[PDB]
Amino acid sequence: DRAEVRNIPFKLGMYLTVGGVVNSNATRFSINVGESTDSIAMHMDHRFSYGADQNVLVLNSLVHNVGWQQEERSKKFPFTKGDHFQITITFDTHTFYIQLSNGETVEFPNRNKDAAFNLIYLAGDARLTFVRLE
Amino acid sequence: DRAEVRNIPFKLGMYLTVGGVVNSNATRFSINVGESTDSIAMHMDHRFSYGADQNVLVLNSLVHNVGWQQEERSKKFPFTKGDHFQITITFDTHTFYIQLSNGETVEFPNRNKDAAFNLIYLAGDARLTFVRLE
Numbered sequence: 652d653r654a655e656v657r658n659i660p661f662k663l664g665m666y667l668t669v670g671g672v673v674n675s676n677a678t679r680f681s682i683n684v685g686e687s688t689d690s691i692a693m694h695m696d697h698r699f700s701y702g703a704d705q706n707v708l709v710l711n712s713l714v715h716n717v718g719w720q721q722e723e724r725s726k727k728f729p730f731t732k733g734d735h736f737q738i739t740i741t742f743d744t745h746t747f748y749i750q751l752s753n754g755e756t757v758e759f760p761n762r763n764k765d766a767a768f769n770l771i772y773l774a775g776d777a778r779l780t781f782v783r784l785e
Numbered sequence: 786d787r788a789e790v791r792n793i794p795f796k797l798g799m800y801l802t803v804g805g806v807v808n809s810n811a812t813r814f815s816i817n818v819g820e821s822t823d824s825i826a827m828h829m830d831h832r833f834s835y836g837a838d839q840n841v842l843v844l845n846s847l848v849h850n851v852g853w854q855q856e857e858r859s860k861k862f863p864f865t866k867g868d869h870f871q872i873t874i875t876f877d878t879h880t881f882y883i884q885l886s887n888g889e890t891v892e893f894p895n896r897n898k899d900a901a902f903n904l905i906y907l908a909g910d911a912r913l914t915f916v917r918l919e
């Protein structure tokens with residue numbers, strides 16, 4: 652089952668740091684910040700091989716009973732199957748600030764202007780090893 | 786709903802630190818380390834007023850489809866309704882090492898000799914504000 656932190660509010664100004672390991676033959680895994688598995692304010696998918704996407708990040712939001720909004724992509728991909736990764740996220744009213752394993756950064760809009768989130772979870776072909784939310 | 790960290794293995798040698806706030810009129814709240822809401826290796830209940838228990842800690846384990854084992858109690862109680870608390874837990878094969886808000890400590894046996902746990906959760910009349918598991 653997915654790895655998740657639930658009902659510990661991730662509030663404006665706090666930092667989230669997750670560490671984990673990518674599966675050896677992973678297709679893709681995502682890190683997700685939102686309210687539920689059907690309501691995601693920041694989805695960041697790490698695609699090793701998914702349709703036409705090879706070694707790319709795909710970011711988006713998921714709206715409950717509505718679906719996926721406008722995707723954003725990054726070619727930054729310091730991720731390796733079988734190896735550890737670390738991701739750090741913080742946000743303000745307008746922007747999610749994401750930092751990747753190698754120090755490179757991606758930003759994604761806070762489309763609802765949310766000030767807090769009650770669910771963080773990893774899905775797909777990876778596992779989490781540690782978390783700091785504070 | 787309860788506050789929980791699920792499927793991020795709390796392994797031998799790692800530290801868990803949780804911060805939160807006690808509800809103003811709290812009866813009791815617990816911090817729980819185990820596998821499920823019916824399988825708890827270390828339950829630590831903070832009882833402000835519960836039956837005959839006033840301002841006491843009660844620790845125990847809960848075995849799936851079996852029930853509560855032998856309780857252990859502590860009179861250490863540096864907890865106040867409406868106020869923040871912080872708890873730090875680590876364990877080895879035989880012992881859970883718990884440190885309370887004021888630096889006082891409680892120990893509780895690792896009765897199954899478990900080396901890892903997939904569920905941490907808070908229940909009852911409090912809320913969590915931060916977590917470190919690493």
Ligand SMILES: OC[C@H]1O[C@@H](O[C@H]2[C@H](O)[C@@H](O)[C@H](O)O[C@@H]2CO)[C@H](O)[C@@H](O)[C@H]1O
Pocket residue numbers: 694696709710711719720722
């Ligand atoms: O937008 C994130 C979302 O993508 C879905 O896949 C998209 C894919 O990125 C797009 O190229 C194709 O046109 O449509 C697919 C279906 O919506 C993933 O399925 C989904 O899990 C999220 O990762």
Ligand SMILES: OC[C@H]1O[C@@H](O[C@H]2[C@H](O)[C@@H](O)[C@H](O)O[C@@H]2CO)[C@H](O)[C@@H](O)[C@H]1O
Pocket residue numbers: 828830843844845853854856
């Ligand atoms: O053992 C922890 C467990 O206690 C239950 O309450 C006990 C109570 O401590 C004991 O004094 C009384 O003899 O039996 C009660 C019922 O088992 C709590 O109900 C339970 O939630 C845990 O906190």
